[PDB]
Design a binder for these strands. Structure first.
Lengths: 108, 108
DNA sequence: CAACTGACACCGAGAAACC
DNA sequence: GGTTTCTCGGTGTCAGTTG
Protein backbone atom coordinates (compact mmCIF):
# COMPACT_ATOMS: atom_id res chain seq x y z
CA UNK A 1 0.00 0.00 0.00
CA UNK A 2 1.00 3.63 -0.50
CA UNK A 3 3.28 2.89 -3.44
CA UNK A 4 2.50 6.26 -5.05
CA UNK A 5 4.58 8.32 -2.61
CA UNK A 6 7.93 6.52 -2.88
CA UNK A 7 7.40 5.93 -6.61
CA UNK A 8 6.95 9.62 -7.39
CA UNK A 9 9.91 10.66 -5.22
CA UNK A 10 12.09 8.18 -7.10
CA UNK A 11 10.78 9.51 -10.41
CA UNK A 12 11.62 13.12 -9.53
CA UNK A 13 15.06 12.27 -8.12
CA UNK A 14 15.84 10.25 -11.27
CA UNK A 15 15.92 13.35 -13.47
CA UNK A 16 14.98 11.10 -16.39
CA UNK A 17 11.74 13.08 -16.81
CA UNK A 18 12.48 16.55 -18.32
CA UNK A 19 9.18 17.34 -13.60
CA UNK A 20 11.90 18.71 -11.33
CA UNK A 21 12.29 19.71 -7.69
CA UNK A 22 11.50 23.38 -7.08
CA UNK A 23 13.23 23.57 -3.68
CA UNK A 24 16.13 21.69 -2.10
CA UNK A 25 14.15 20.39 0.89
CA UNK A 26 12.59 17.91 -1.60
CA UNK A 27 9.10 18.90 -0.43
CA UNK A 28 7.80 20.93 -3.41
CA UNK A 29 8.26 19.82 -7.02
CA UNK A 30 7.25 20.60 -10.60
CA UNK A 31 5.25 18.40 -12.98
CA UNK A 32 4.51 18.82 -16.71
CA UNK A 33 0.88 19.17 -17.73
CA UNK A 34 0.66 19.72 -21.49
CA UNK A 35 -2.75 19.34 -23.09
CA UNK A 36 -3.03 16.44 -25.55
CA UNK A 37 -4.72 18.70 -28.13
CA UNK A 38 -1.95 21.25 -28.63
CA UNK A 39 0.20 20.99 -31.77
CA UNK A 40 3.24 20.90 -29.44
CA UNK A 41 2.19 17.54 -27.95
CA UNK A 42 4.62 14.66 -28.38
CA UNK A 43 2.77 11.54 -27.25
CA UNK A 44 6.02 10.06 -25.89
CA UNK A 45 7.73 12.65 -23.67
CA UNK A 46 4.53 14.42 -22.59
CA UNK A 47 2.74 11.21 -21.55
CA UNK A 48 5.86 9.42 -20.27
CA UNK A 49 5.01 9.54 -16.55
CA UNK A 50 1.34 8.80 -17.25
CA UNK A 51 2.38 5.69 -19.17
CA UNK A 52 4.91 4.70 -16.49
CA UNK A 53 2.33 4.76 -13.69
CA UNK A 54 0.08 2.59 -15.88
CA UNK A 55 3.04 0.27 -16.50
CA UNK A 56 4.03 0.22 -12.82
CA UNK A 57 0.68 -0.77 -11.30
CA UNK A 58 0.09 -3.26 -14.13
CA UNK A 59 -2.64 -1.34 -15.96
CA UNK A 60 -1.14 -1.07 -19.46
CA UNK A 61 0.64 -4.10 -20.94
CA UNK A 62 2.88 -3.58 -23.95
CA UNK A 63 1.70 -5.11 -27.22
CA UNK A 64 -1.48 -6.40 -25.57
CA UNK A 65 -3.70 -3.40 -24.83
CA UNK A 66 -4.52 -0.35 -26.92
CA UNK A 67 -2.65 2.74 -25.65
CA UNK A 68 -4.76 5.56 -24.24
CA UNK A 69 -2.85 8.54 -22.77
CA UNK A 70 -6.07 10.29 -21.62
CA UNK A 71 -6.90 7.46 -19.20
CA UNK A 72 -3.26 7.41 -18.08
CA UNK A 73 -3.43 11.16 -17.43
CA UNK A 74 -6.71 10.84 -15.52
CA UNK A 75 -5.48 7.99 -13.30
CA UNK A 76 -2.45 9.92 -12.05
CA UNK A 77 -4.44 13.07 -11.25
CA UNK A 78 -7.05 11.16 -9.23
CA UNK A 79 -4.23 9.31 -7.46
CA UNK A 80 -2.42 12.54 -6.53
CA UNK A 81 -5.68 14.23 -5.52
CA UNK A 82 -6.98 11.31 -3.45
CA UNK A 83 -3.64 10.57 -1.78
CA UNK A 84 -3.06 12.43 1.50
CA UNK A 85 0.63 12.58 0.53
CA UNK A 86 0.51 15.28 -2.17
CA UNK A 87 -1.24 18.64 -1.83
CA UNK A 88 -1.28 20.68 -5.04
CA UNK A 89 -0.41 24.38 -4.93
CA UNK A 90 -3.08 25.48 -7.39
CA UNK A 91 -2.27 29.19 -7.07
CA UNK A 92 1.34 28.49 -8.08
CA UNK A 93 0.36 26.20 -10.98
CA UNK A 94 1.62 27.96 -14.12
CA UNK A 95 -0.63 26.15 -16.60
CA UNK A 96 -0.53 28.73 -19.42
CA UNK A 97 3.02 28.93 -20.82
CA UNK A 98 5.12 27.30 -23.57
CA UNK A 99 5.62 24.29 -21.25
CA UNK A 100 2.78 24.26 -18.71
CA UNK A 101 3.33 22.75 -15.29
CA UNK A 102 1.74 22.31 -11.87
CA UNK A 103 3.24 22.63 -8.39
CA UNK A 104 2.71 20.04 -5.64
CA UNK A 105 3.83 19.60 -2.04
CA UNK A 106 4.53 16.57 0.16
CA UNK A 107 3.76 16.45 3.89
CA UNK A 108 4.70 13.93 6.65
CA UNK B 1 -22.95 -16.79 10.26
CA UNK B 2 -26.27 -15.48 8.95
CA UNK B 3 -25.40 -14.54 5.35
CA UNK B 4 -26.16 -17.96 3.84
CA UNK B 5 -29.69 -18.57 5.13
CA UNK B 6 -30.60 -14.88 4.80
CA UNK B 7 -29.74 -14.62 1.10
CA UNK B 8 -31.43 -17.95 0.34
CA UNK B 9 -34.60 -16.55 1.90
CA UNK B 10 -34.26 -13.35 -0.15
CA UNK B 11 -34.01 -15.14 -3.51
CA UNK B 12 -36.73 -17.66 -2.63
CA UNK B 13 -39.01 -14.81 -1.56
CA UNK B 14 -38.93 -13.35 -5.07
CA UNK B 15 -39.69 -9.91 -3.58
CA UNK B 16 -36.71 -8.29 -5.35
CA UNK B 17 -36.75 -8.11 -9.17
CA UNK B 18 -33.86 -9.85 -10.89
CA UNK B 19 -33.11 -12.02 -7.83
CA UNK B 20 -33.87 -15.40 -9.41
CA UNK B 21 -32.29 -18.84 -9.72
CA UNK B 22 -30.94 -20.72 -12.73
CA UNK B 23 -31.70 -24.37 -11.89
CA UNK B 24 -34.17 -26.46 -9.90
CA UNK B 25 -31.62 -27.43 -7.23
CA UNK B 26 -31.50 -23.72 -6.26
CA UNK B 27 -27.69 -23.82 -6.33
CA UNK B 28 -27.00 -21.09 -8.93
CA UNK B 29 -28.73 -17.70 -8.88
CA UNK B 30 -28.50 -14.28 -10.49
CA UNK B 31 -28.06 -11.22 -8.26
CA UNK B 32 -29.00 -7.77 -9.64
CA UNK B 33 -25.87 -5.60 -9.63
CA UNK B 34 -26.17 -2.09 -11.08
CA UNK B 35 -23.95 0.97 -10.83
CA UNK B 36 -25.38 3.88 -8.83
CA UNK B 37 -26.36 6.26 -13.97
CA UNK B 38 -28.99 4.84 -16.37
CA UNK B 39 -32.36 4.32 -14.58
CA UNK B 40 -30.82 3.64 -11.16
CA UNK B 41 -33.42 4.15 -8.44
CA UNK B 42 -32.67 3.85 -4.74
CA UNK B 43 -35.91 1.88 -4.26
CA UNK B 44 -36.09 -1.08 -6.64
CA UNK B 45 -32.41 -1.26 -7.63
CA UNK B 46 -30.98 -0.88 -4.11
CA UNK B 47 -33.59 -2.67 -1.98
CA UNK B 48 -31.70 -5.83 -1.01
CA UNK B 49 -28.74 -3.70 0.12
CA UNK B 50 -30.97 -1.83 2.58
CA UNK B 51 -32.37 -5.11 3.93
CA UNK B 52 -28.94 -6.39 5.01
CA UNK B 53 -28.26 -3.13 6.86
CA UNK B 54 -31.63 -3.33 8.61
CA UNK B 55 -31.32 -7.07 9.28
CA UNK B 56 -27.95 -6.63 11.01
CA UNK B 57 -29.12 -3.40 12.67
CA UNK B 58 -26.68 -1.24 10.70
CA UNK B 59 -29.37 1.27 9.69
CA UNK B 60 -32.28 2.51 11.81
CA UNK B 61 -35.13 3.96 9.76
CA UNK B 62 -35.42 7.67 10.49
CA UNK B 63 -32.18 7.95 12.50
CA UNK B 64 -29.19 7.08 10.33
CA UNK B 65 -28.67 8.87 7.03
CA UNK B 66 -29.44 6.68 3.99
CA UNK B 67 -26.12 5.65 2.42
CA UNK B 68 -26.68 3.22 -0.48
CA UNK B 69 -22.92 3.14 -1.35
CA UNK B 70 -21.83 1.61 1.97
CA UNK B 71 -24.94 -0.59 2.03
CA UNK B 72 -23.86 -2.19 -1.24
CA UNK B 73 -20.23 -2.15 -0.08
CA UNK B 74 -21.05 -4.11 3.08
CA UNK B 75 -23.06 -6.73 1.20
CA UNK B 76 -20.33 -6.99 -1.45
CA UNK B 77 -17.47 -7.34 1.04
CA UNK B 78 -19.41 -10.00 2.96
CA UNK B 79 -20.59 -11.81 -0.18
CA UNK B 80 -17.11 -11.96 -1.73
CA UNK B 81 -15.34 -13.07 1.47
CA UNK B 82 -18.03 -15.68 2.21
CA UNK B 83 -16.98 -19.30 1.68
CA UNK B 84 -20.63 -20.32 1.17
CA UNK B 85 -20.84 -18.35 -2.09
CA UNK B 86 -18.85 -18.77 -5.32
CA UNK B 87 -18.73 -15.89 -7.81
CA UNK B 88 -18.89 -17.32 -11.34
CA UNK B 89 -17.05 -14.56 -13.19
CA UNK B 90 -17.49 -16.27 -16.57
CA UNK B 91 -21.31 -15.98 -16.59
CA UNK B 92 -21.26 -12.55 -14.91
CA UNK B 93 -23.17 -10.43 -17.44
CA UNK B 94 -21.78 -6.98 -16.65
CA UNK B 95 -22.30 -5.56 -20.15
CA UNK B 96 -26.11 -5.57 -20.41
CA UNK B 97 -28.98 -3.22 -19.58
CA UNK B 98 -29.58 -4.75 -16.12
CA UNK B 99 -26.22 -6.38 -15.31
CA UNK B 100 -26.35 -9.39 -13.00
CA UNK B 101 -23.83 -11.67 -11.32
CA UNK B 102 -23.88 -15.46 -11.00
CA UNK B 103 -23.33 -17.03 -7.58
CA UNK B 104 -23.25 -20.70 -6.61
CA UNK B 105 -24.15 -22.00 -3.14
CA UNK B 106 -21.56 -24.62 -2.19
CA UNK B 107 -23.02 -27.41 -0.01
CA UNK B 108 -21.61 -28.20 3.41
C1' DC C 1 -14.85 15.98 -31.58
C1' DA C 2 -11.24 14.21 -28.56
C1' DA C 3 -9.49 15.78 -24.08
C1' DC C 4 -10.09 17.32 -19.42
C1' DT C 5 -12.14 17.88 -14.96
C1' DG C 6 -14.48 17.47 -10.02
C1' DA C 7 -17.94 14.96 -7.48
C1' DC C 8 -19.28 10.70 -6.43
C1' DA C 9 -19.42 5.63 -6.56
C1' DC C 10 -16.72 1.47 -6.60
C1' DC C 11 -13.19 -2.18 -5.31
C1' DG C 12 -10.04 -5.90 -3.11
C1' DA C 13 -7.10 -7.09 0.42
C1' DG C 14 -5.29 -7.02 4.95
C1' DA C 15 -6.81 -5.61 9.48
C1' DA C 16 -9.70 -5.28 12.82
C1' DA C 17 -14.22 -6.34 15.26
C1' DC C 18 -17.31 -9.79 16.55
C1' DC C 19 -19.37 -14.30 17.34
C1' DG D 1 -10.96 -20.25 15.04
C1' DG D 2 -14.82 -18.48 12.03
C1' DT D 3 -17.44 -14.91 10.18
C1' DT D 4 -18.83 -9.93 9.20
C1' DT D 5 -17.14 -5.30 9.11
C1' DC D 6 -13.92 -1.52 8.81
C1' DT D 7 -9.70 0.99 6.25
C1' DC D 8 -7.32 2.46 2.66
C1' DG D 9 -5.01 3.48 -1.56
C1' DG D 10 -6.18 3.37 -5.54
C1' DT D 11 -9.74 3.19 -9.61
C1' DG D 12 -14.20 3.85 -12.51
C1' DT D 13 -18.38 6.60 -14.07
C1' DC D 14 -20.89 10.76 -15.44
C1' DA D 15 -22.19 15.25 -16.65
C1' DG D 16 -20.55 19.42 -17.88
C1' DT D 17 -16.47 21.98 -19.48
C1' DT D 18 -12.67 22.87 -22.66
C1' DG D 19 -8.97 23.11 -26.32
Amino acid sequence: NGKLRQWLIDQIDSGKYPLVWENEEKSIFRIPWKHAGKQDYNREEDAALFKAWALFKGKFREGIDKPDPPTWKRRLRCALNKSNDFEELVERSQLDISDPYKVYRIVP
